[PDB]
């Protein structure tokens, strides 16, 4: 189906040395029987569990097709390139864990469109630029770690960021804010 | 007369093309005769054949080769040949077979190809040819094979290709053609054996004329937007062996006339909107494969299908099929794949499915199938994938069925199956996913489950399994999901849970588990989801739990005591620790 | 990659 095709696209663009994605047969009617993929009672993907799988390569915008996905777990890998904009089209996403990877470029503004997101762990990456102010508008956000990154600029202290601690924004290139030691100019 | 510079002409070809791997090293200018050169064939010493397949040759089509006067067979298959095909190709007037497959050739097809009278075989597959097919193609004199597969042709489908009488095979598949109807004039192709028109953007009804091709062996009109009732005239294909109409918008009832096809073996009309009962006459034919899946077909599968001794593929899933599977199914046939999933099929399964011993896939999910698993299936070592879920199956599982070696998925979920998992489970080497959820199964998990290191998923939710978890279960490092919820499991978790390094999910909820949470829970690197709710787990929560990054944590309704650690104080752990009396913590409502 | 003319392999 559409969800399985989107995941197979990811298989093609990722490097899988240990063949952890071998179960991902596109000829299967749905991807739920695949290992590392979990589905709801209506056979729609809700989890992709690929943490510490020695995966390299890059993500695809087709991950956006998975409208009922709640948990995207790609942590402790060597995945490179940018986080796609289409990840904002993941309306039901609750956890985005991309930490301990070599992701680069900006944190998409689209991530603010994740109305029900509860966990954002992007730490230990090479992500660059400013922290989008869209993220503050995610009411459900309870966990945020943007540490060990090379981001820059104003650190939001409003909305969901109101409760957040310095450990969330630690070891960054030039973050200015109340949470930071240095003020914003 | 009767002398030529054929070797020189070949040397001109060699100079024209780039040969990095020096494949044309044998071609020695200094040599008198070229007829011992690599890939060069002389039928006197005149060149009749050149084959330079897979030579890593790069450059334009060498039009100088046409000056080879007796050349009849030219293949440049699987090369880096580039540019437009030169119209001066007509100069090769003695050519009978031309293979230019898997080349980077681009642009419009040369109309001059038709001007070669002698051409019998033309293959231009895997090229970037674009535009309309030349009208000259209608005047091919002696061409039997036309292949333009996997090109960029954006034209309509030519009616004039119908006027090539000698043609045996029309292969135009996987081309981005302008949406176009199948020419009725294609019916006048008397000698045609193969019509390969898959992914040709075909629209409209299938012509009645296609029936008049009695030499037709393969009809592939699949992966197109063809609509309308399947033509009854199709039964006129006396020599038809294969009909593929899958992934089309065709509506109507499968014609009874298809039974009249004695040589028919493989029919696929799957992923269509076809309605009505499957014909008895079609099932009477000794079919090799019958796929009618993802249709709006209704009624009972005719029992006549069992008589075929050639049946390895039956995929009729996604239909409203009532009644039961034929008793003799799999007894007289080399059954490999059965998909009757998402149908209303009822009754006991036919017992003799694996009689031939080549059965790999048994898929019967979302049906009303009742009774006990036939004992014969225990003997079926050929099985690799078993899905019996969402039926009304009862009774114990045959001991052998647990131990089938090449089964990787065993799904008995949502049935009424009873009994204890056998120690024969140790023999299931390939098993990666074991799903026994929502059954009436009872007993203690065998220690032989620990034998299955390659096992990745264990789901036994909604079962009556009881007792201490085998210490062997902790040896399953590759396990990524363990769901043991809604069970009577008892006992204490050991320090050996440390070996569950690859575990993503642990669910032990609605169980009678007792004792302290092992402090080795933090050592589980990829644990993201933990449910220990509705248990009798006691003592202080491990501080190692904080080190874990958990998206789901429930320790609710346990006997856990002591102060909640500082991280756990957050309102994100609000409903995580309800119902543990000795838990006193920062959250509003706790203690 | 080049495909062949034969039955579809969609399975559950
Ligand atoms: C697959 O098996 C599941 C378990 O046998 C079954 O699930 C369940 O769904 C029904 C409703 O269809 C629930 O219903 C009732 O029970 C609750 C209390 O638990 C009451 O509040 C309701 O009024 C009602 O009586 C079951 O509780 C629920 N059980 C479980 C364990 O999930 C699925 O429906 C089965 N699916 C198929 C397709 O067969
Ligand atoms: C096309 O020709 C090339 C050689 O020109 C074939 O390729 C190579 O690939 C083989 C199989 O994938 C290897 O076994 C060879 O060692 C390798 N050689 C070189 C020099 O790269 C290629 O497979 C051919 N393709 C087909 C379909 O026959
Ligand atoms: C067709 O392929 C040939 C070989 O790859 C291309 O090129 C040649 O051009 C090169 C510069 O790009 C020269 O360094 C080569 O020596 C030369 N070789 C020959 C035999 O001419 C050629 O440009 C390609 N044409 C297209 C349109 O892609
Ligand atoms: C034209 O299409 C047919 C598809 O039917 C191609 O192939 C078939 O040819 C193969 C050659 O090895 C055989 O192994 C297949 O069994 C046979 N299939 C049928 C159903 O007849 C054929 O090669 C194509 N020709 C070209 C030149 O591309
Ligand atoms: C912090 O982020 C919030 C996010 O909403 C910013 O919000 C204003 O919110 C309203 C909606 O109620 C929007 O219409 C405005 O566009 C937002 N303001 C601006 C300037 O864009 C808020 O401004 C941000 N404040 C700080 C200090 O960073
Ligand atoms: C039809 O085919 C014949 C013989 O191959 C040829 O002479 C004639 O010109 C063709 N007509 C058309 C319209 O292509
Ligand atoms: C296990 O089953 C899979 C899928 O059926 C198959 O590809 C694989 O080769 C099998 N391995 C063994 C050792 O049987
Ligand atoms: C824990 O389980 C109970 C029911 O046993 C449920 O009501 C509660 O909401 C659950 N909490 C979490 C965090 O899942």
Residue numbers in the entry:
A (entry chain BBB): 27 to 211
B (entry chain AAA): 14 to 56, 59 to 606
C (entry chain CCC): 79 to 90
From the paper:
The vastly different binding affinities between IDA/IDLs vs. CLE9 to HSL1 prompted us to determine co-crystal structures of four HSL1-IDA/IDL-SERK1 ternary complexes with: IDA, IDL1, IDL2, and IDL3 (at 2.31 Å, 2.38 Å, 2.20 Å, and 2.70 Å, respectively) and the HSL1-CLE9-SERK1 complex at 2.87 Å. In agreement with our biochemical assays, the crystal structures revealed that all IDA/IDL peptides specifically bind to the peptide-binding surface of HSL1. IDA/IDLs adopt a fully extended conformation in the structure. The co-receptor SERK1 interacts with the C-terminal region of the different IDA/IDL peptides (residues 68-69 in IDA), completing the peptide-binding pocket using its N-terminal loop region. Superposition of the four crystal structures yielded an R.M.S.D of ~0.6 Å comparing 590 Cα atom pairs, with IDL peptides perfectly aligning to each other. HSL1 forms stable heterodimeric complexes with SERK1 in the presence of IDA/IDL peptides in analytical size-exclusion chromatography experiments (SEC). However, HSL1 displays an extended hydrogen-bonding network in its core ligand interaction surface, accounting for the higher binding affinity to IDA/IDL peptides when compared to HAESA.
